[PDB]
């Protein structure tokens, strides 16, 4: 077979990208077998840190004790490999002895996925010619969940996980999200139980053709600010000042890379998962959790929504609609972990348990601690928007307290003064829960809520 | 008109990529106008460091004194902007006062980017700053800046080859030797019988008379041309290294650390302090295919998709143990070697292969993309050292898998290998000294042999086999 005439850019295809993702992170490693020794290391209590670039085919890493992997000095063993022809059946890498002052590999490693991931492997010493019994097992460390790193106190958590609050949060979204597509029969049924999204026969659909101009954006901003106010009476919940940056690559900051996978502040991006039989969803989710999406979308939002000239072109309604329909749904899925997904009108008791803090579904998103951090950030941009109009249109926006919340008077830049909190503004706990279940059944009688509007770019 | 229903991944297209490349790096900055002051800073001798991700649309950076941009503590001003609707005609960003304990922007910047075409650095950014504290009630402030992009320093400005080595390298004998050694074996499979007989007549056929080892024909992996490639470069390294310490790279240089993660490291990169920084890709006027290809192979993605794979494979005993020295040499030459040249190449019009105007022999002509000049570039020696060290990995590979099947042998004063199962030939080609059977090397003969061989947007030699992937 004729050899290639030239190299070409050989980015990882789907299979190599997924394999890279299974390998990337921190592993607990033990040596196994009669002849299993690495110079200057114990047999137990080792770690393997691996990195593959997002479309890389090279494999890099380090092998040492946990303490040495976080230390300043070069780890004892460096991993160098490549994923050409690699699969679950064969992952190979060389070890370099960084104490030897030589980059010549000392060991040949081969591994198999035994099916967060387990590697079962063989190490051969390259000093001796090919038989020795030198094996290892590597168990990938759990990617900690946000609730394992930011503790919401018992009083906040009690409010958040309650049936009335979960159903309220889900129905508030579903009513205004589905309004433009609901028959007049559905609409009159919701009107009947005070759950129409805003004023009777002047409802503010969030996703219809007039979504940017009908003031639905004001409902978005106001309901979340009201929620933040109540949450913040029970617990200190500091907004993000800056959006968290993607993990620093292992090549540049080995301790920073390793820490990222311990999610120490609860703000690490949980790695994308593969949706069985849904490649479009898999690609979409992987996209929005990527560094590329940070630099192409999230950093753009971070700039524009603190840009006075950008914000000064928008009514509070236009701003709310724009930020909700783009950034807000992407914040949910970028920080989403784990979970097949709950059907919107499925009220099985298990879904109410405090463990259910899935960011992909408003029934549960508010239970996730990261929710409060990025809602804090969104809510702070309203102040950027106010300062923008005070610079470019002094006095055209007026402050005003509304439902106990610092807010804004209707004006040239604030289309309405009656923000929608549900029946409380425009409409026993048990009758309330039942009314909300009925309202959800009217609307709704697989992918998570915040994935239902997924659009791939042409590139993907 | 309807607003979008959802966001989608919005990677920079070609224009935003090229704009981000014009912005990326370190700028010398001065404030100007009657109201131009940043608190705690001088007016002149400031610097602006900007970064955009390779397909990023966000703009980040810092504005402080040169010493403060290299210091551990937060710089006084942080840049936050985006390139949506940006062009050379309008780039905007905000400044954040990092001493204030607030991320609320303190300044609005709007700039214009001007190329340089005649001093004055590598592009200019200039425009107006507005203080965001100062009300609209207040009259218009006169607050301007000019920023000049710093030169990306050339390898020869950072690794000095000594007078004796440089004298050998830049000489007509050595430049024509190196160009002709490549051209003969690279063009052989496309030369007519007259051209081939004419080269045979002056002893310049690539390897044995009538059994020539073309480097690029259909049997290129199996005809032992790879041995000629490895051996000629080893012989050149041995001579260069008698005259100057030239350490191989142990590991391929990593791509620049992003500004977001190591500000001082990112800034140093652009000073090319060790001479091993990747010179930023340049736009080939009227050659988008070449521009894209060059950009691709100078990218972080190419490091992790191609270069790091070559780094792995060519130190992998099991990989190397499948190859004869000939197969190895041909593989490494045709892939990694041409890509190493163009990844570290800095801008020279490219010289025509048979243009021997005196100015082309000057020491300034060290263009990595042409073998008439590539050996004059100091980085050439670092990556040729790396390639030459992999021959030892290959030997060790066969000593592990095929003990005794490869034997060492001194050849033309160079530590080498005997012919055998894994070494196809024993007569490596150095040119007429080793294989000349015609009818110090004569300069006019080499120019005659180049004219025989070399008798459309122009591209350098090591770009002539460029192939884009369907992705690009």
Q: Where are the alpha helices (DSSP H) in B244-347?
A: 263-270, 288-297, 300-302, 308-313, 317-320, 325-332, 338-343
Q: Are residue A352 and residue A390 in the same domain, yes or no?
A: yes
Is B106 in the same domain as B163? Answer: no
Q: Measure in Å the smallest separation between the Cα of A335 and chain B Cα atoms.
A: 16
Is B411 in a helix, a strand, or coil?
strand
Among B89, B120, B151, residue at a domain's last position: B151
B375 annotated to a ligand binding site: no
Q: Which residues of A touch B311 (CB under 8 A)?
A: 58, 80
* Whether residue A293 sits in one domain with residue A154: yes
Nearest to A162 by CA among A431, A2, A447, A366: A366
Taking Cα atoms as reference points, which of B320, B338, B218 lies closest to residue A7?
B338
Containing A281, the helix (H) or strand (E) segment is helix A279-288
Whether chain A has a CB inside 8 Å of the CB on B466: the answer is yes
The CATH number for A113's domain is 2.40.128.120
> For chain B, how many structural domains are there in total?
2
Does one domain contain both B77 and B199?
no
Are A132 and A124 spatial neighbours (Cβ–Cβ below 8 Å)? yes
Length, in residues, of chain B: 472
Cα–Cα distance for residue pair A333/A331, rounded to 1 Å? 6
Rounded to a whole number of angstroms, the CA Rg of chain A reads: 26
Q: Is residue A40 part of a domain?
A: yes
* One domain, residues B146 and B227: no
Q: What phi, psi does A234 have (nearest 5°)?
A: -100, -25
Q: A63: which residues sit within 8 A by CB, 6+ positions away?
A: A29, A38, A41, A46, A47, A48, A75, A76, A77, A78, A79, A95
Is residue B182 part of an annotated ligand binding site? yes
CA–centroid distance for B61 within its chain: 25
**A125 shares its domain with A269:** no
Beta-bridge partners for B28:
B47, B148
Q: Alpha-carbon distance B332 to B337, whole Å?
A: 6
* CB-CB contact of A400 with A424 (8 Å): no
- Name the nearest CA neighbour of A52 among A251, A228, A239: A251
Q: Measure the CA–CA gap between A12 and A20, rounded to whole angstroms.
A: 9
Distance CA(A261)–CA(A50), nearest Å, equals 11
Quote the CA–CA distance of A370 and A267 in Å, as a whole number.
7
If DSSP codes are grouped into helix, strand and coil, which group holds residue A95?
Answer: strand
Q: B118 is written with which tokens? A: 């005649």
**Vertex B207: Cα angle to B206 and B212 (nearest 5):** 75
Determined by X-ray
DSSP letters of A153-219?
Answer: PHHHHHHHHSHHHHHHHHHHHHHHHHGGGS-HHHHHHHHHTT-SSSSTTS---SSSTTTTTSSHHHH
CA dihedral A82, B289, B229, B275 (to 10 degrees): -80
Lookup result for tokens 């030699």: B461
What are the residues facing B78 on neighbouring strands? B62, B96
Question: What Å resolution does this PDB entry report?
Answer: 2.1
For testing contact with chain A, the best of B94, B221, B312 (most A CBs within 10 A):
B312
Residue of A58, A65, A433 whose CA lies nearest to A251:
A58
Asked if residue B134 belongs to a domain, the reply is yes
Q: Whole domain around residue B397: which residue ranges?
A: 156-463
Please check whether residue B92 lies inside any domain of the structure.
yes
Contacts of B139 (CB under 8 A, 6+ apart): none
Residue B468 is assigned to a structural domain of this protein: no
Gap between the Cα atoms of B128 and B44, Å rounded: 16
Distances (CA, A) of B455 to B147, B286, B354, B448: 48, 25, 8, 10
My answer on whether B178 and B304 are in the same domain is: yes
B52 CB burial (10 A radius; 0-12, 13-18, 19+): buried
Domain membership of residue A457 (yes or no) is no
Burial class (CB in 10 A: 0-12, 13-18, 19+), B67: exposed
Nearest to A272 by CA among A317, A228, A336, A198: A336
Burial class for B190, CB neighbours closer than 10 Å (0-12, 13-18, 19+)? exposed
Counting every residue written for chain A, the total comes to 460
CA A23, A287, B469, A6 torsion-angle sign:
negative
Domain edge (last residue) among A141, A174, A194: A141
Contacts of A285 in chain B (CB under 8 A): none
Those residues with Cβ within 8 angstroms of residue B465's Cβ, 6 or more apart along the chain or in another chain: A5, A6, B334, B338
Q: Which of A100, A121, A141 is the last residue of a domain?
A: A141
**Residue B109 falls inside a structural domain:** yes
Nearest to A110 by CA among B316, B385, B151, B400: B316
**Alpha carbon distance B56, B48 (integer Å):** 19
Q: Got the DSSP string for A107-139?
A: EEEEEEE----EEEEEEEESSS------EEEEE
Residue A26 host element (H or E):
strand A25-32
Same domain, A58 and A176: no
Return the CATH number at B56.
2.40.128
Alpha-carbon span A223 to A180, nearest angstrom:
20
- In B182-245 the beta strands, taken as DSSP E runs, fall at none
The shortest CB-CB distance from B315 to any of A80, A292, A297 is to: A80
Query: What one-character DSSP code corresponds to residue B262?
Result: -
**CB–CB contact B302 A330 (8 Å):** no
Q: How far apart are CA B149 and CA B134, in angstroms?
A: 30
DSSP E strands in B33-143: the ranges are 46-51, 58-64, 77-82, 91-97, 105-114, 124-131
Give the C-alpha distances (Å, rounded to integers) separating B154 from A48, A94, B276: 39, 34, 9
Is A142 part of any known ligand binding site? no
Give the pair of three-digit tokens for residue A389.
């109009």
* Position B5 in a domain: no
B260 touches chain A (CB under 8 A): yes
Is residue A304 helix, strand or coil?
helix
b or e along B334-361 (b: 16 or more beta carbons within 10 Å of the residue's beta carbon)?
bbbbbbbbbbbbbebebbebeebeeebb
A390 located within any domain: yes
Measuring CA to CA, how many Å separate A27 from each of A80, A258, A265, A350?
16, 10, 20, 32
CB proximity list for A206: less than 8 A, separation 6 or greater: A176, A177, A179, A197, A216, A219, A220, A321, A324, A325
Q: Which long-range contacts (CB under 8 A, 24 or more apart) does A170-173 make?
A: A170/A344, A170/A361, A170/A362, A170/A363, A170/A440, A171/A195, A171/A422, A171/A436, A171/A439, A171/A440, A171/A443, A172/A223, A172/A362, A172/A420, A172/A421, A172/A422, A173/A362, A173/A449
Contact criterion met (CB below 8 Å) for B412 and B430: yes
Q: How far is CA A112 from CA A12, A46, A59, B129, in A?
A: 20, 18, 15, 58
């Amino acid at each position: 077979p004729q050899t290639p005439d030239e190299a070409s850019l050989d980015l990882a295809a789907t299979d190599g990208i997924r394999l890279g993702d299974r390998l990337r992170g921190l592993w607990d490693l033990r040596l196994v077998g009669g002849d299993a020794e690495l110079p200057g290391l114990p047999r137990e209590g080792l770690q393997l840190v691996l990195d593959v670039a997002p479309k890389g085919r090279g494999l890099i890493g380090y092998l040492d004790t946990p303490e040495r992997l976080l230390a300043a000095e070069p780890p004892r063993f460096r991993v160098l490999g490549d994923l050409l022809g690699a699969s679950s059946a064969s992952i190979r890498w060389r070890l370099v002895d960084q104490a030897s002052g030589s980059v010549a590999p000392t060991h040949d490693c081969s591994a198999v996925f035994d099916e967060d991931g387990t590697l079962s492997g063989r190490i051969q010493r390259l000093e001796r010619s090919p038989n020795e019994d030198f094996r290892f097992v590597a168990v990938k460390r759990h990617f900690p969940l946000a609730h394992e790193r930011i503790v919401l106190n018992e009083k906040l958590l009690g409010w958040l996980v309650s049936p009335q609050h979960r159903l309220f949060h889900q129905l508030w979204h579903a009513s205004r999200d589905k309004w433009h597509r609901l028959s007049e029969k559905q609409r009159n049924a919701l009107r009947g139980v005070g759950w129409q999204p805003g004023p009777l026969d002047r409802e503010r659909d969030a996703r219809g053709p007039r979504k940017d101009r009908n003031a639905s954006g004001i409902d978005f901003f106001f309901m979340h600010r009201h929620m933040l106010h109540t949450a913040r009476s029970m617990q200190d919940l500091p907004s993000w000042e800056r959006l968290p940056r993607p993990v620093v690559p292992l090549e540049y900051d080995r301790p920073g890379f390793i820490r990222y996978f311990d999610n120490p502040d609860g703000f690490s991006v949980p790695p994308a998962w593969v949706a069985v039989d849904d490649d479009e969803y898999s690609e979409w989710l992987h996209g929005l959790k990527s560094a590329e999406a940070y630099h192409a979308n999230f950093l753009v939002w971070e700039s524009q929504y603190q840009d006075p000239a950008y914000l000064a072109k928008l009514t509070l309604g236009q701003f709310g609609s724009e930020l909700e329909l783009g950034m807000h749904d992407w914040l949910h899925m970028r920080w989403a972990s784990v979970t097949t997904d709950r059907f919107p009108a499925d009220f099985a008791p298990r879904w109410f348990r405090p463990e259910n803090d899935f960011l992909g579904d408003p029934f549960s998103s508010h239970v996730n601690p990261v929710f409060w951090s990025f809602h804090g950030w969104i809510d702070d941009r309203i102040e950027d928007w106010y300062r923008a109009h005070e610079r470019f249109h002094p006095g055209e926006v007026q402050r005003r307290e509304v439902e106990g919340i610092q807010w804004f008077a209707p004006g040239r830049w604030v289309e309405v003064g009656d923000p929608w909190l549900g029946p409380a503004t425009h409409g026993s706990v048990e009758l309330d829960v039942e009314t909300m279940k009925l309202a959800l059944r009217i609307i709704f009688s697989r992918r998570p809520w915040y994935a239902r509007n997924l659009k791939l770019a042409r590139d993907q």
